[PDB]
Amino acid sequence: SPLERIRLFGRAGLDVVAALGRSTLFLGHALLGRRTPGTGLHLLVKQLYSVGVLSLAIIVVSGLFIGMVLALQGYNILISYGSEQAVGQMVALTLLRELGPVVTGLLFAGRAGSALTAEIGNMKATEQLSSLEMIGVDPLKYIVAPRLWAGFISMPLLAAIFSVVGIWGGAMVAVDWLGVYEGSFWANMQNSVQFTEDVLNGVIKSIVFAFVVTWIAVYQGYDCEPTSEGISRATTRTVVYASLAVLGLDFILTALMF
Amino acid sequence: SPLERIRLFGRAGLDVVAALGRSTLFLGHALLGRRTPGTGLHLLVKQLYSVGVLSLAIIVVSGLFIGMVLALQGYNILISYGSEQAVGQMVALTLLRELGPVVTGLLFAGRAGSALTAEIGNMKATEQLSSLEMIGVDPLKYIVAPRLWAGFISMPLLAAIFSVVGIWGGAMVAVDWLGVYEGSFWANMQNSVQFTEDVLNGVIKSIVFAFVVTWIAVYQGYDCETSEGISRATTRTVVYASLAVLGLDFILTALMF
Amino acid sequence: TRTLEIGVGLFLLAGLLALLLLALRVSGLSVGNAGDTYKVYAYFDNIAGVTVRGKVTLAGVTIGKVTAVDLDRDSYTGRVTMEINQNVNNLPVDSTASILTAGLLGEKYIGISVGGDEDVLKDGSTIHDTQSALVLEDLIGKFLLNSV
Amino acid sequence: QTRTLEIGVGLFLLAGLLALLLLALRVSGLSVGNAGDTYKVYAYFDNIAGVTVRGKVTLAGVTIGKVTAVDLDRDSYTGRVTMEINQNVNNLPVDSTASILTAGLLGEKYIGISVGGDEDVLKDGSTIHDTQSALVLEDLIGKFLLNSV
Amino acid sequence: TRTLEIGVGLFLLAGLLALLLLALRVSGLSVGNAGDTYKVYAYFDNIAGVTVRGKVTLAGVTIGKVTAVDLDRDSYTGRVTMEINQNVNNLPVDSTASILTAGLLGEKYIGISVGGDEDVLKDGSTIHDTQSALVLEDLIGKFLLNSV
Amino acid sequence: TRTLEIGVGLFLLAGLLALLLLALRVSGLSVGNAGDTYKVYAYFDNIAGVTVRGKVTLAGVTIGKVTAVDLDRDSYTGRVTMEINQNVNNLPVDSTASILTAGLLGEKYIGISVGGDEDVLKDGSTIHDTQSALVLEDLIGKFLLNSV
Amino acid sequence: QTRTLEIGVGLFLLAGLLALLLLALRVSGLSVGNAGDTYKVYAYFDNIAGVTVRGKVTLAGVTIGKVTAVDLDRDSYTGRVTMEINQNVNNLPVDSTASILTAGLLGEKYIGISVGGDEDVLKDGSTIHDTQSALVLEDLIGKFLLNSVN
Amino acid sequence: TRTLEIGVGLFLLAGLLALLLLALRVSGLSVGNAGDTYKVYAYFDNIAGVTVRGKVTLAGVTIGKVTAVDLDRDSYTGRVTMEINQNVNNLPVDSTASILTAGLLGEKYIGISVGGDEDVLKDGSTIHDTQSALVLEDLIGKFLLNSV
Ligand SMILES: CCCCCCCCCCCCCCCC(=O)OC[C@H](COP(=O)(O)O)OC(=O)CCCCCCCCCCCCCCC
Numbered sequence A: 001s002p003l004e005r006i007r008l009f010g011r012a013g014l015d016v017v018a019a020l021g022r023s024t025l026f027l028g029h030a031l032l033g034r035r036t037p038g039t040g041l042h043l044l045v046k047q048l049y050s051v052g053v054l055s056l057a058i059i060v061v062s063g064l065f066i067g068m069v070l071a072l073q074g075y076n077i078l079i080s081y082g083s084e085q086a087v088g089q090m091v092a093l094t095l096l097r098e099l100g101p102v103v104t105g106l107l108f109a110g111r112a113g114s115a116l117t118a119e120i121g122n123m124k125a126t127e128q129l130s131s132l133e134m135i136g137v138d139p140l141k142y143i144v145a146p147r148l149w150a151g152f153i154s155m156p157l158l159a160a161i162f163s164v165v166g167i168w169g170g171a172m173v174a175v176d177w178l179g180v181y182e183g184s185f186w187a188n189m190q191n192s193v194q195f196t197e198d199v200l201n202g203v204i205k206s207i208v209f210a211f212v213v214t215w216i217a218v219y220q221g222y223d224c225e226p227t228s229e230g231i232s233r234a235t236t237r238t239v240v241y242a243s244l245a246v247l248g249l250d251f252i253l254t255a256l257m258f
Numbered sequence B: 001s002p003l004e005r006i007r008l009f010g011r012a013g014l015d016v017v018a019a020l021g022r023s024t025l026f027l028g029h030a031l032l033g034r035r036t037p038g039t040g041l042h043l044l045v046k047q048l049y050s051v052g053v054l055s056l057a058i059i060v061v062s063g064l065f066i067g068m069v070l071a072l073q074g075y076n077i078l079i080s081y082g083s084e085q086a087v088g089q090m091v092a093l094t095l096l097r098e099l100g101p102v103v104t105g106l107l108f109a110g111r112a113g114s115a116l117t118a119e120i121g122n123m124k125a126t127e128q129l130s131s132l133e134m135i136g137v138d139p140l141k142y143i144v145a146p147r148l149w150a151g152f153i154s155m156p157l158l159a160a161i162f163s164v165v166g167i168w169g170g171a172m173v174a175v176d177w178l179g180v181y182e183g184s185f186w187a188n189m190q191n192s193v194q195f196t197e198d199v200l201n202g203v204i205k206s207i208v209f210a211f212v213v214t215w216i217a218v219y220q221g222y223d224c225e226t227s228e229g230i231s232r233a234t235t236r237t238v239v240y241a242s243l244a245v246l247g248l249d250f251i252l253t254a255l256m257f
Numbered sequence C, E, F, H: 001t002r003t004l005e006i007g008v009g010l011f012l013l014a015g016l017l018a019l020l021l022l023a024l025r026v027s028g029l030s031v032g033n034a035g036d037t038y039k040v041y042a043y044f045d046n047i048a049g050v051t052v053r054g055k056v057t058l059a060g061v062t063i064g065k066v067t068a069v070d071l072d073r074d075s076y077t078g079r080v081t082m083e084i085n086q087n088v089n090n091l092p093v094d095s096t097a098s099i100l101t102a103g104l105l106g107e108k109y110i111g112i113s114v115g116g117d118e119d120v121l122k123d124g125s126t127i128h129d130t131q132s133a134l135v136l137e138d139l140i141g142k143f144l145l146n147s148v
Numbered sequence D: 001q002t003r004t005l006e007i008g009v010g011l012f013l014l015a016g017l018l019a020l021l022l023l024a025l026r027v028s029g030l031s032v033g034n035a036g037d038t039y040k041v042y043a044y045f046d047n048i049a050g051v052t053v054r055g056k057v058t059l060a061g062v063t064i065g066k067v068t069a070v071d072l073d074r075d076s077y078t079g080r081v082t083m084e085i086n087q088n089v090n091n092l093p094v095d096s097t098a099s100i101l102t103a104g105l106l107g108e109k110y111i112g113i114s115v116g117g118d119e120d121v122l123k124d125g126s127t128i129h130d131t132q133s134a135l136v137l138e139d140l141i142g143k144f145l146l147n148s149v
Numbered sequence G: 001q002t003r004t005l006e007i008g009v010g011l012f013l014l015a016g017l018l019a020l021l022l023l024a025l026r027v028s029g030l031s032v033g034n035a036g037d038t039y040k041v042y043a044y045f046d047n048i049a050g051v052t053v054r055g056k057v058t059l060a061g062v063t064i065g066k067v068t069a070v071d072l073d074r075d076s077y078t079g080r081v082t083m084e085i086n087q088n089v090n091n092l093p094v095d096s097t098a099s100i101l102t103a104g105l106l107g108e109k110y111i112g113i114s115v116g117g118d119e120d121v122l123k124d125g126s127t128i129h130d131t132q133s134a135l136v137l138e139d140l141i142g143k144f145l146l147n148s149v150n
């Protein structure tokens, strides 16, 4: 029914904001509720291994590939102008203030934005997440709080590693594959980036996603209906919403500081 | 134990080079095996609705956002070069030559590279596929062949729509808030875009990691084990498809700058 | 009031259809650009760099956008059709047009120059006199190779 | 009634998200601890070819403010530029002449204000009476450099 | 069902529209706003920066697109083959096809004059006279060395 | 287990080392490139293209950067505050700083031409003699309308 | 034995990826028929400031070929430039001079070729003996600014 | 099945170590003894567009590189050092070394005119007579501001 079709559309629209409110309530209860008996730093270490260290190969190979792509592309574009000796400035500018954090968002929200959701989802749907409440250990401060704290402090480091490897792998193609002066590359690079305006800007732009990607990647896993299909649908809702959030919040955070 | 770890690493190295073989044989059986009794075009339409039309609300908004980002950024890096008019010849180059076709891969392989493998793995887990061979219908050419054909002919259209919306967003933000002369903007853009080396280049660049994203999104779901198996296969296909988007991006742009 | 909350569906549609209209609102006008623009025509001898949608200017400030360019098959001159803002309507007929250059490299934009006479305009009329656009050829071919 | 609280918090945070409009949201464009408010001023020119809004108005080179309005008067057909000047500088005499200079050789054309000399400073919300136009390439070339040869 | 087919058809049409828009409204090709066009040959003693896909023009309005350049293996001249929109064919044969640098540092395009009122054209014929391509050398190799 | 704890530690230290490498080997940050040196003031008549962090120089080789630009409301002139390399402490007071464009169209920097005097520098004193920056308008506006 | 076939076709696919498509190496462009067969030409100049490699060599503006390399003739202490010409255009006489020209006003310096006047055409592997050098903003302004103005 | 399991494992490890060794070899690829490039000094009065790692050349072709620039504390003038490929070792001392501008706007480089004929060089010596780089101001400041 068309009127019931609009009813269902409005229902989904209100469900979205209801879920957003439930999600921020869940994040509040997770980050600063109380110190549960089972809580410890070993949790954070295990998750930092499950979220960051496992996501190192993907992000490093991505950095190398996207870096040599950025270089081999700009060198063509700069060849017509003649300032190819400034290619090093280009990759260190785009892959460090815009394409660095954005791609490492689209990618950290792909591996650890889906692995996290599927993991704690399969937790919820095998009662492993409920059986923690019977033992008394609040699941938030034990199952998700280390996920949140291992996403907050592992996506910025991933973005830094990604930008470093991308810059280096852009040099490795501009220099030893397309032949520009390596010294010129590095020199013209470190004269036009203005750390306090581009490097720290990219780091803040990456932190804001790190907060908004590991929050909608662990909520969407703590909220999926407990079945084998609700989980396979949540590990797609989280990738969609996290790529969308990376893009949108990067648009905001670059309009906030050009 | 060191020696057992080396044995396991060699085993994984033989597996990944054998999986590519099994995946290639699966793609072969899927695309040009025979004509299964239950196939048709209705399947292609249905899976084109699940792969493409449901993945419109993500990549269109992504195109808008990355377009205004590309403009609002280049103009800032060009305000000090004096050529703030070349913004048109930028949001129609970066968002066309490399970033626009690639991000559509990094994103299509997140919405329909993961939902595809989940929908085609949970099928294997709920015995759907195994219950299709008993009816006599080849599961490959009924369940996975329409996925392949809905990924081949819906990622390039996704990339084209993404690039169009990105160009228009870069325009809207380049003229409204940046005040760049709309005339010179569209002029420089239309002039220095060189269709045969940028538009068709982006389109073939998109077809490559369409064929390669829908291939490893469908296979990784036709070859997964249980809910824990699929919940891992979807992560595996998201990772492998982002990797095969970026790697194929490098390999392709190296063949045509 | 949940059956009443079908109205939020309309709150979203009217908020999305408004976004659609804003997407087609790309004209740069609220009260400033044109409001309700009005036509005028001009005949130049050379319009080298006045590709369509370029800004027209009186005393520098923009007035409208050149709507189209035309090669008048009669005399092979450039008849440009340009739109003018509503509020600006005191432009006398003897106000002659000329093709200035954006800065020193930017593409050419046309401007008008008030000459001053009673009969203002007709907004559908045309401009008779004008000064053509320069060209780095005639400037050195007819004024550098000519006397030096 | 948990949906009530969830929707309440969801709206209270969607507001804080749309509290990031970020489209001329901070009408002051430097920081949260700089000077702040600004004075207004107008000038009447004969040609303002390149005075695109949000540019720079300066004195002796140091930026003083930005151009806000580029209006045109219907009566005299002269461009009226409405700019603002930072609060710290408020001591510019009325006889100061505004002239449009071209940054470098091709850079964005800014409006400088050469100080004359008088006791009465300004109303800072009033207009300027004198000026010097912006030398456009075409009219200049055709008039003078063509006249010599 | 049918909503499925309508949705997928709309999506396919949107993809094809996006492809055609990226082609035409961004680059432009044989397909596009322009219809049929006729070729014309011309002989320049030099075509310094003239590349394909320039803007052959008259009085500023675009007349078409240059198609091919060649060094005539007999006279060592620049044979330029260009396209002219059929919207304008009234141009005379006995005109001058000059090259002009756009603005100050724009693309070196081709302008043509009006050749009196003689036999109009064959639209596939050649041109008689043309002003060669100016460069920095033919100027600053005579008027700065062998002059004041 | 400590079997993986080093892995987390190793790659966290790798991330932090990458942050430091981005902040140091790409930006020349406060690790030490030029020491803690003292400022010097200069009074000009026009500082148009003198942005922050310019390249204050002598004989072409870089000396340091300008820290601040100011409009001293008393005489309405340009107060530029620039840092001088501390080891370079032989710049006499009679030396004059002039605003020069870098080459032909580079950013407007200031360069200090040595005058030569016994007393050298307070490193915090002001300069007196200078040649203010050129401006196209005043230049072509006083040497084209009168001379030729 | 099926795993053997799987790994075999896997190696085959990896070979199809690496050998045929990757390695971004030696050009087979028209290596069978309809080729260009670029031929070398030497030219001695006095200043080749903006004649870096991969530039353009042209006659009357239409590109004739590209510049292969540049070097310093140790004995002459002058610039030597080696550039290629397509075998289709083999009608350029010997006394045809080369000249460094600037594209537009700022476009990179290419090598134009002014035709000669002898009947001996070329060898396409020979040299060019007479030419005109390039200009340089400093020596140029250094000549006619303080000698014919003051 | 196991005699070749760890065999292909070690084959892959060898391939990976070869790849890592290929990656590491960028920084200091094969510089060794700087090939056959040896230092030589130069003095100038003003070197504006001469930054580190600039270009040096003779007759246009690159001769080597521009090593470093500095300010001598005594004469308050600019010293610069450059590395010269030994393939050219016939550059006499009376050879001049001026500053030129790449094309017309490209970054300033150092060109060397071979000069006369005398004792050639020790590649570690110091060139003596030369001409500085033009600065825009003084030109228009003494040829326009004074003569025309
Ligand atoms: C020109 C105008 C156009 C510009 C539009 C602006 C868009 C702004 C960007 C949109 C945000 C995308 C998020 C998508 C997620 C979603 O839809 O949300 C969808 C889900 C609910 O969906 P379900 O139906 O599946 O439950 O909600 C959530 O997951 C809740 C978490 C969302 C977090 C939102 C972002 C918070 C911002 C925090 C910034 C402050 C950080 C600073 C800390 C240091």
Ligand SMILES: CCCCCCCCCCCCCCCC(=O)OC[C@H](COP(=O)(O)O)OC(=O)CCCCCCCCCCCCCCC
Pocket: B015, B016, B019, B020, B023, B208, B212, B215, B216, B219, B236, B240, B243, B244, B247, B248, B251, G017, G021
């Ligand atoms: C114009 C030319 C036309 C282009 C032709 C397209 C080529 C297609 C090749 C795609 C290969 C993927 C096959 C399917 C994979 C699969 O399903 O197989 C999936 C299996 C998974 O096995 P597991 O079960 O063990 O996880 O293996 C993979 O995950 C493969 C990862 C995909 C990575 C592809 C990247 C290729 C480019 C690499 C860059 C090279 C580095 C060099 C840089 C210096």
